[PDB]
Amino acid sequence: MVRVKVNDRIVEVPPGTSVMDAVFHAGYDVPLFCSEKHLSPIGACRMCLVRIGLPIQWQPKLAASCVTAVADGMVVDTLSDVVREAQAGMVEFTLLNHPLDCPTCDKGGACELQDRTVEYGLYEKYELPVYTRFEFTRRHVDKHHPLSPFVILDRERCIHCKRCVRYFEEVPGDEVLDFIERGVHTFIGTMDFGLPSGFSGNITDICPVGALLDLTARFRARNWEMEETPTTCALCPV
Amino acid sequence: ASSERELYEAWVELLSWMREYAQAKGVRFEKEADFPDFIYRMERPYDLPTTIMTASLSDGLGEPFLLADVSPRHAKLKRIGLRLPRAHIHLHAHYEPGKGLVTGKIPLTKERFFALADRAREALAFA
Amino acid sequence: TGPILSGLDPRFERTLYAHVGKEGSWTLDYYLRHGGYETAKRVLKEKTPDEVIEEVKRSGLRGRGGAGFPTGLKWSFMPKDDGKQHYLICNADESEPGSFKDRYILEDVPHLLIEGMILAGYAIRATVGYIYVRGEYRRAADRLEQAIKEARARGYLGKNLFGTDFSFDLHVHRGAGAYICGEETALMNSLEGLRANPRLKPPFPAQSGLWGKPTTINNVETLASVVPIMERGADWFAQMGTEQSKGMKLYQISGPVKRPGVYELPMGTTFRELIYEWAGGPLEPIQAIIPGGSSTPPLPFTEEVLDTPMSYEHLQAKGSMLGTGGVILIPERVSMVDAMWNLTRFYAHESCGKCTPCREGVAGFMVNLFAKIGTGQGEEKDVENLEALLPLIEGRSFCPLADAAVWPVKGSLRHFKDQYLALAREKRPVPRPSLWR
Amino acid sequence: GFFDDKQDFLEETFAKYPPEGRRAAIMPLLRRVQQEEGWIRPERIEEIARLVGTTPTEVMGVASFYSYYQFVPTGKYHLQVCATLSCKLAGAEELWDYLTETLGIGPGEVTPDGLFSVQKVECLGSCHTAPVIQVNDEPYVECVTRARLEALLAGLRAGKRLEEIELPGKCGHHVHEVE
Numbered sequence A: 001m002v003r004v005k006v007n008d009r010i011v012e013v014p015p016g017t018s019v020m021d022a023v024f025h026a027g028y029d030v031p032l033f034c035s036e037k038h039l040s041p042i043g044a045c046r047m048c049l050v051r052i053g054l055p056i057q058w059q060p061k062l063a064a065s066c067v068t069a070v071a072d073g074m075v076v077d078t079l080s081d082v083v084r085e086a087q088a089g090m091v092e093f094t095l096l097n098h099p100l101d102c103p104t105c106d107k108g109g110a111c112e113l114q115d116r117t118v119e120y121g122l123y124e125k126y127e128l129p130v131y132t133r134f135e136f137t138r139r140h141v142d143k144h145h146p147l148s149p150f151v152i153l154d155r156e157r158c159i160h161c162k163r164c165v166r167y168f169e170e171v172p173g174d175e176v177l178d179f180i181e182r183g184v185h186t187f188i189g190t191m192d193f194g195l196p197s198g199f200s201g202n203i204t205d206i207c208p209v210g211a212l213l214d215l216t217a218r219f220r221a222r223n224w225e226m227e228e229t230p231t232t233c234a235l236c237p238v
Numbered sequence B: 001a002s003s004e005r006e007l008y009e010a011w012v013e014l015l016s017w018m019r020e021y022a023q024a025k026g027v028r029f030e031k032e033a034d035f036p037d038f039i040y041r042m043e044r045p046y047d048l049p050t051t052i053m054t055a056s057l058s059d060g061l062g063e064p065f066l067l068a069d070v071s072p073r074h075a076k077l078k079r080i081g082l083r084l085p086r087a088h089i090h091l092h093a094h095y096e097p098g099k100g101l102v103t104g105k106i107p108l109t110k111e112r113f114f115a116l117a118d119r120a121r122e123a124l125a126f127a
Numbered sequence C: 001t002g003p004i005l006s007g008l009d010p011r012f013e014r015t016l017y018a019h020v021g022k023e024g025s026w027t028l029d030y031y032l033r034h035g036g037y038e039t040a041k042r043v044l045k046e047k048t049p050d051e052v053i054e055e056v057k058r059s060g061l062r063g064r065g066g067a068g069f070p071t072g073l074k075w076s077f078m079p080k081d082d083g084k085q086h087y088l089i090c091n092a093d094e095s096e097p098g099s100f101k102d103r104y105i106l107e108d109v110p111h112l113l114i115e116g117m118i119l120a121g122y123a124i125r126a127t128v129g130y131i132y133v134r135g136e137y138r139r140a141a142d143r144l145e146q147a148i149k150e151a152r153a154r155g156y157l158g159k160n161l162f163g164t165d166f167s168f169d170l171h172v173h174r175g176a177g178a179y180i181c182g183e184e185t186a187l188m189n190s191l192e193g194l195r196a197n198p199r200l201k202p203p204f205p206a207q208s209g210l211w212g213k214p215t216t217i218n219n220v221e222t223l224a225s226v227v228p229i230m231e232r233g234a235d236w237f238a239q240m241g242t243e244q245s246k247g248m249k250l251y252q253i254s255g256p257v258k259r260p261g262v263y264e265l266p267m268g269t270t271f272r273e274l275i276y277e278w279a280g281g282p283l284e285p286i287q288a289i290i291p292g293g294s295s296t297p298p299l300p301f302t303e304e305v306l307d308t309p310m311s312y313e314h315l316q317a318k319g320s321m322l323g324t325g326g327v328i329l330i331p332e333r334v335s336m337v338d339a340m341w342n343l344t345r346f347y348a349h350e351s352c353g354k355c356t357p358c359r360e361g362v363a364g365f366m367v368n369l370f371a372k373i374g375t376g377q378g379e380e381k382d383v384e385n386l387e388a389l390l391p392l393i394e395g396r397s398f399c400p401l402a403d404a405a406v407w408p409v410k411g412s413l414r415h416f417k418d419q420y421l422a423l424a425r426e427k428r429p430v431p432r433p434s435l436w437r
Numbered sequence D: 001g002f003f004d005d006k007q008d009f010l011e012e013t014f015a016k017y018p019p020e021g022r023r024a025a026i027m028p029l030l031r032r033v034q035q036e037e038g039w040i041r042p043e044r045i046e047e048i049a050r051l052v053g054t055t056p057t058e059v060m061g062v063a064s065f066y067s068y069y070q071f072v073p074t075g076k077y078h079l080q081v082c083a084t085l086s087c088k089l090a091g092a093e094e095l096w097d098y099l100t101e102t103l104g105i106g107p108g109e110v111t112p113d114g115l116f117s118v119q120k121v122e123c124l125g126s127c128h129t130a131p132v133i134q135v136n137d138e139p140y141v142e143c144v145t146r147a148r149l150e151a152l153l154a155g156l157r158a159g160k161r162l163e164e165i166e167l168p169g170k171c172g173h174h175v176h177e178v179e
Ligand SMILES: NC(=O)C1=CN([C@@H]2O[C@H](COP(=O)(O)OP(=O)(O)OC[C@H]3O[C@@H](n4cnc5c(N)ncnc54)[C@H](O)[C@@H]3O)[C@@H](O)[C@H]2O)C=CC1
Pocket: C063, C064, C065, C066, C067, C069, C074, C077, C093, C094, C095, C096, C099, C182, C184, C204, C206, C219, C293, C295, C322, C323, C324, C400
């Protein structure tokens, strides 16, 4: 086992461990979009950056903690002004081309983006506070479009965390969703229409925002207004 | 200038063309989004000729073969925008004084528009 | 003379571009006559794989991909004998603005490439090698295919070359318009039939590359350079250059200059030599030059710069870098703001979409900052913003592309901040001089 | 069915890649469709998917990643103007305005005659001979000066094949001289 020191807290952990799960095992924490449980970890959203020392020799650039293996006697800084300043910049860049439908968005208060934004956004550099630096036309595109009788896609909302395409290839194995043009013009789309997989609904739970949404239950109530009942499905033997 | 006003005067007109074409070729026209600056204008004043910011020409399956937007009121570098979804073609129409709705230099007429949308319908339309 | 080769030396010998532009240079016959696959025959029978890696390493050759990484040490990374298929890849997708030196190797001396890749492939136990060219280089695509055809006809590519027990065959893969396919790792994905997003590069292409198998990737100029180095030894090669930049280099030059183009010089010759002696001097007053690629931070048109040795060290410690040798001079008649306004609306077009900081960050925020301030709509505030944007992107994108877009901007502020503030304060658009005839 | 016609092209291109790597074939196939038909129709993508042996979606996402592939009808000669710095310092902007103006067309549109289609492009790889224009996927038309450009136009408009149209002036190889 490898001896890692996250912030001030030191933690044991097996060799094949991410610096992310290292930092979450410790207690501390960090932004988090593209990365998901049981999905291949990548560094795409670039929010889980941390500072790393491997002495006290600190590395010159920030590391995406979700795709970095812990070395022995490693040091992880998640609090420094350097980190926070970045974190709040990654929030900023995400919301750059985001829609502005929060109240009228089925992604209620259950929305990873909403949440993280208020968790790490709006840096406190040390006069009126500046909420939004970006002041140009946003990314208008295809909106409120049903992929199936069960799913409804909102392209504007998508923040490109690679979760859904990534999930389709890996878990069920049905490549029925993938990105389209490149650059700032890219969106999610299908050419398999029906949304053919018998495991399509699961994207609904992974999506960090309200692009991919369970249409069986469009506009019923807000997320906190539900009376959640933890039980088991008795439709089959599993 | 007052060009800001005259821009929206044309944005409605473009919409009109779109609705015309939609019923004339019998294809789906869709309001894709209303201006946020209107839903959240509380008691504040508002005088733009309509409320639709994103409009589209979608097909049988509902997938867009034409997209249209216009920059919100309180936004910088204002232009109206024509985008043909899957074929990587973006367009930026501004408004010249005494000239009209132009794409850099070419007049974006009702004629020229219909050409684009027909071309786009035949090609891009899934069903 | 006495010591070291660095320019117009009477002792410098043209090697790569020697036959480019000579009538029918690309024929398998022209090649056989003026020299032939003689060097490769030799080495395949005499020197061993590990030996040929040494001679290349001793020479001090570094990736003319623009990276500058010891191609010797690079081959060193391949697994020795693991009973696994290995692949060699030629990166012949040359999409760096102001950088066009690989084009003509493919168009006019293709067999020079085939010869080098046979050498290299042998060094690493690769029996299969591919050539990702650009879908825009048409002639280069044809001549390279042509040559690979007639090389198989005479048995220079096939099951048992030169009677030795080594087999080498080549495959041309054309592109289809994407600067990002130039990146070694994404390049693979593109060819492989996926969307061309760079992969996780902590696992290098020597341990896992094309279809997972141990592969190695090199520039067209890198690979071509392998021939003269195996022909006339590492010492002939190291006889040219500086303390850390050995060999010759295909510097190219565009912009307003008497006679623009590709010029083979030793590594170390001066900007003053390229721009003047060969290129023939400027046609307008120049204000800055973009030294290597466009990914390179520009420098001012000063006497102290003109006397700098074009190297993986002299430009390094001048606040820039030697890219691909692609120089571009920029006139005073055009605004440095306008220059970058352009370059950046390029990196915007070419971004792949994978990262937030590059996608949204440069292709959204950054291109539009310029836009504003380049139409005389920008306040001093929009200059400050653009400024403080950089360090949020530069350090930590996914691949160096986003770096490539800010580095040049940063430099342009570091040397020309006055042109920006000036356009912002006077609410002035960028000057539009008449430039085309 | 576009490829039933030419199963010999398939044999030969699939054969450049390993059994476990048929998707590699995608690029080369799209490539063909384009040079044959001038653009990629949806059915063409559903076909290619079936050959390569993967889903439609996958292929279309890959297909739309690249600039060269057109997904709507394009003129007989689809002019691709270089736009970046070197060609800008050469006059690419003015070239583009003069072009778009004379023809009266921007991106998605095709001239009334069916023969001229326009598009901006990035650094084509010959900046010493700027400004640059690629016609379809034929070797470039370098040094497009106003004089030259009008020539190129009248030539194609007259019906001459591009490989052989007489252009005024002289254009260098890997080095170019100006006066
Ligand atoms: N010729 C052209 O058309 C273009 C050239 N470029 C150039 O690309 C350059 C940067 O390219 P990159 O490959 O991304 O730089 P890099 O930082 O990833 O280093 C590149 C090379 O070093 C090797 N390498 C580094 N550490 C290694 C290790 N621990 N083990 C094994 N191999 C290792 C890589 O395999 C690679 O060959 C720029 O300087 C730029 O000028 C950019 C665009 C176009």
